[PDB]
RNA sequence: CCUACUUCACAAAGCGCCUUCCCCCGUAAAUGAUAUCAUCUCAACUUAGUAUUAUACCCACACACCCAAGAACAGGGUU
């Protein structure tokens, strides 16, 4: 409050840079978060015509995780336009080809199907690994919590935690195991 | 293999195994008994 | 950072929400051709090319030059 | 009843403990007294208020203009009290009614600045291949009210 | 637990064996899960629970030895398969796409080239139906098919 | 003057200098300009929030496109607060 | 593409000549639990097993005349 008109408007309608870490995250949940931010539906001043979308930088998109057998079952379909140009590629093959395609397509499908969609997609920055360009890193403002909490492995559990968990059963001594 | 909607063991050595998503009747003694679901 | 309190009769809710200042420790010191043009502008402003192309006289004359102003 | 700590052993949302009623009442009294003292000392600038007028709720402040979509049976320039004030708020505190604040707390006053008719609204009915076409023009009465002041009293 | 050692001469020696923790919450139960009040409160990612029924190389232990109910043995087996496919048991191995809740073996599912019409869509299974009865903490039921 | 802003009515130059003068009159040291929040620093539409601190205490912060503009406008906010002509001040009584 | 031959003739053609490069998966195995044997495994895991086509091609911001470039335009050359 007490700002001048132009600075106040600039602050209100400024676009913020968010960071998502895609490691072990479902591309769909990443895409939901990113699509909300790209549309600007996270802002109370939101309106379809106010162009109030924000920048989303998703890193480690190479390390996304699909639930179920989606890596093998989910099929991405495209057509080159030419006869016989129908191409159907499983998620695993598409991921091996382009380590950004799966998250990009998820976000593209979640965004509203209008002319603003590609302007929004211009504000989406996908990076396969931990590396991010220096200018993007300097732009970053906030990091969004990962939608899925990564379960711990036994190798990661501490011996104290293992001990704290009770033993469930008495194994017979005379067993090879 | 022979494609069958219902798999039936024929001799004693015909064994059912679910491989690559579907059931098979394999048989060492009588490979004629090979069946695929 | 809000304090909620019903009044004694329980008919009005009182919310105390003072504005919290940013700690000094949470701050940093102040540091001390058409095709290519449209590509450059699109890259600069993270938009698509379509925004930057001109519009016909019909659209330009349709635009309102004295729009109402509020506040 | 002890269940070993697993992913599904306890609800994902954090468990919540009801504060002891004695301390809850003490804290409530402290907050209410503090805000009442702020009101007494006039430690507030602009006040806004959500006020239920006509059929709608208006977010209002002093000097604001409000367009009611109906005539009010009031001469222009006549001063009025808006009695259904749902919310009154300042920079540092807000008071919420359940659902309405008491008359003793808040006094929102307005003035009938204008009595007008809305611009002509067109009602057009058309059905294809039925020779069904009807046109009507309706102008709604309107009253512009200016909110003059919002006063609060230390009656908490 | 007996282990066989070779030197040829081979012999079996019984080594240290863990025991059930003291004070089960529900003594006198059919299965360990019931004894410890875990009927519907463990998931594929509960490695601490799952590994207690796992051979050192990753295989499941027989139901006779474990004492588990039939249904609970099936649930544990399926949860263990899912944990292995999710990579949560890196040390229980015989000797790169991140997954989880994988019902089927990755090499046995064919791609869904022709998903059907809206009323006959071919859905991608997620998780296991064996866990359908788990504790529901969500307003909507958790979907087994995506 | 209803709805008007202090410096929309009273045109000033170098609000930072004017604020320094006022703080000298009040025997307060020169405020420290410090970057509270930032966004899109390297882009063509940055957002900078610059706050003025008096003895590690925030007196006023302001937004802007460049750091200089944000600092200038934070000085303007500080002047408004000192003069008591803030936006959320008590309305005029009629 | 035109050296020859042939239709022909400052060139266009074939009837003439030149060049054309990786795979796809059905199964067959290894170790191995559920079910201490066995078991290719919609168990974990190890091979045949590979598309993540490999490449190659193209990439110079800014009159007139002639041309193997061409309907116009465009393109190339004019030292
Ligand atoms: Zn047989």
JSON list of N, CA and C in Angstrom, two decimals, chain D residues 70-77 112-117 141-145:
[
{"chain": "D", "resi": 70, "resn": "UNK", "atom": "N", "xyz": [-32.33, -0.34, -8.19]},
{"chain": "D", "resi": 70, "resn": "UNK", "atom": "CA", "xyz": [-33.74, -0.11, -7.93]},
{"chain": "D", "resi": 70, "resn": "UNK", "atom": "C", "xyz": [-33.89, 1.22, -7.21]},
{"chain": "D", "resi": 71, "resn": "UNK", "atom": "N", "xyz": [-35.06, 1.83, -7.37]},
{"chain": "D", "resi": 71, "resn": "UNK", "atom": "CA", "xyz": [-35.35, 3.06, -6.66]},
{"chain": "D", "resi": 71, "resn": "UNK", "atom": "C", "xyz": [-35.56, 2.76, -5.18]},
{"chain": "D", "resi": 72, "resn": "UNK", "atom": "N", "xyz": [-35.18, 3.71, -4.34]},
{"chain": "D", "resi": 72, "resn": "UNK", "atom": "CA", "xyz": [-35.15, 3.48, -2.90]},
{"chain": "D", "resi": 72, "resn": "UNK", "atom": "C", "xyz": [-36.22, 4.25, -2.14]},
{"chain": "D", "resi": 73, "resn": "UNK", "atom": "N", "xyz": [-37.00, 5.10, -2.80]},
{"chain": "D", "resi": 73, "resn": "UNK", "atom": "CA", "xyz": [-37.97, 5.93, -2.10]},
{"chain": "D", "resi": 73, "resn": "UNK", "atom": "C", "xyz": [-37.28, 6.89, -1.14]},
{"chain": "D", "resi": 74, "resn": "UNK", "atom": "N", "xyz": [-36.22, 7.52, -1.62]},
{"chain": "D", "resi": 74, "resn": "UNK", "atom": "CA", "xyz": [-35.48, 8.51, -0.85]},
{"chain": "D", "resi": 74, "resn": "UNK", "atom": "C", "xyz": [-35.18, 9.69, -1.75]},
{"chain": "D", "resi": 75, "resn": "UNK", "atom": "N", "xyz": [-35.32, 10.89, -1.20]},
{"chain": "D", "resi": 75, "resn": "UNK", "atom": "CA", "xyz": [-34.93, 12.08, -1.94]},
{"chain": "D", "resi": 75, "resn": "UNK", "atom": "C", "xyz": [-33.42, 12.12, -2.10]},
{"chain": "D", "resi": 76, "resn": "UNK", "atom": "N", "xyz": [-32.97, 12.64, -3.23]},
{"chain": "D", "resi": 76, "resn": "UNK", "atom": "CA", "xyz": [-31.54, 12.77, -3.45]},
{"chain": "D", "resi": 76, "resn": "UNK", "atom": "C", "xyz": [-30.94, 13.68, -2.39]},
{"chain": "D", "resi": 77, "resn": "UNK", "atom": "N", "xyz": [-29.72, 13.36, -1.97]},
{"chain": "D", "resi": 77, "resn": "UNK", "atom": "CA", "xyz": [-29.06, 14.09, -0.92]},
{"chain": "D", "resi": 77, "resn": "UNK", "atom": "C", "xyz": [-29.45, 13.67, 0.47]},
{"chain": "D", "resi": 112, "resn": "UNK", "atom": "N", "xyz": [-27.97, 9.45, -0.67]},
{"chain": "D", "resi": 112, "resn": "UNK", "atom": "CA", "xyz": [-28.53, 9.21, -1.99]},
{"chain": "D", "resi": 112, "resn": "UNK", "atom": "C", "xyz": [-28.03, 10.33, -2.90]},
{"chain": "D", "resi": 113, "resn": "UNK", "atom": "N", "xyz": [-27.04, 10.02, -3.73]},
{"chain": "D", "resi": 113, "resn": "UNK", "atom": "CA", "xyz": [-26.47, 11.00, -4.63]},
{"chain": "D", "resi": 113, "resn": "UNK", "atom": "C", "xyz": [-27.24, 11.10, -5.93]},
{"chain": "D", "resi": 114, "resn": "UNK", "atom": "N", "xyz": [-27.77, 9.99, -6.44]},
{"chain": "D", "resi": 114, "resn": "UNK", "atom": "CA", "xyz": [-28.42, 10.04, -7.74]},
{"chain": "D", "resi": 114, "resn": "UNK", "atom": "C", "xyz": [-29.56, 9.05, -7.80]},
{"chain": "D", "resi": 115, "resn": "UNK", "atom": "N", "xyz": [-30.58, 9.40, -8.57]},
{"chain": "D", "resi": 115, "resn": "UNK", "atom": "CA", "xyz": [-31.66, 8.48, -8.92]},
{"chain": "D", "resi": 115, "resn": "UNK", "atom": "C", "xyz": [-31.83, 8.55, -10.43]},
{"chain": "D", "resi": 116, "resn": "UNK", "atom": "N", "xyz": [-31.60, 7.44, -11.11]},
{"chain": "D", "resi": 116, "resn": "UNK", "atom": "CA", "xyz": [-31.45, 7.43, -12.55]},
{"chain": "D", "resi": 116, "resn": "UNK", "atom": "C", "xyz": [-32.19, 6.22, -13.11]},
{"chain": "D", "resi": 117, "resn": "UNK", "atom": "N", "xyz": [-32.17, 6.09, -14.43]},
{"chain": "D", "resi": 117, "resn": "UNK", "atom": "CA", "xyz": [-32.58, 4.88, -15.11]},
{"chain": "D", "resi": 117, "resn": "UNK", "atom": "C", "xyz": [-31.37, 4.28, -15.80]},
{"chain": "D", "resi": 141, "resn": "UNK", "atom": "N", "xyz": [-34.74, 1.16, -12.96]},
{"chain": "D", "resi": 141, "resn": "UNK", "atom": "CA", "xyz": [-34.40, 2.27, -12.06]},
{"chain": "D", "resi": 141, "resn": "UNK", "atom": "C", "xyz": [-33.13, 1.96, -11.29]},
{"chain": "D", "resi": 142, "resn": "UNK", "atom": "N", "xyz": [-32.42, 3.02, -10.90]},
{"chain": "D", "resi": 142, "resn": "UNK", "atom": "CA", "xyz": [-31.15, 2.87, -10.22]},
{"chain": "D", "resi": 142, "resn": "UNK", "atom": "C", "xyz": [-31.01, 4.02, -9.23]},
{"chain": "D", "resi": 143, "resn": "UNK", "atom": "N", "xyz": [-30.25, 3.78, -8.18]},
{"chain": "D", "resi": 143, "resn": "UNK", "atom": "CA", "xyz": [-29.88, 4.82, -7.23]},
{"chain": "D", "resi": 143, "resn": "UNK", "atom": "C", "xyz": [-28.39, 4.72, -6.96]},
{"chain": "D", "resi": 144, "resn": "UNK", "atom": "N", "xyz": [-27.70, 5.83, -7.09]},
{"chain": "D", "resi": 144, "resn": "UNK", "atom": "CA", "xyz": [-26.30, 5.92, -6.70]},
{"chain": "D", "resi": 144, "resn": "UNK", "atom": "C", "xyz": [-26.26, 6.44, -5.27]},
{"chain": "D", "resi": 145, "resn": "UNK", "atom": "N", "xyz": [-25.57, 5.70, -4.41]},
{"chain": "D", "resi": 145, "resn": "UNK", "atom": "CA", "xyz": [-25.34, 6.05, -3.02]},
{"chain": "D", "resi": 145, "resn": "UNK", "atom": "C", "xyz": [-23.85, 6.31, -2.82]}
]
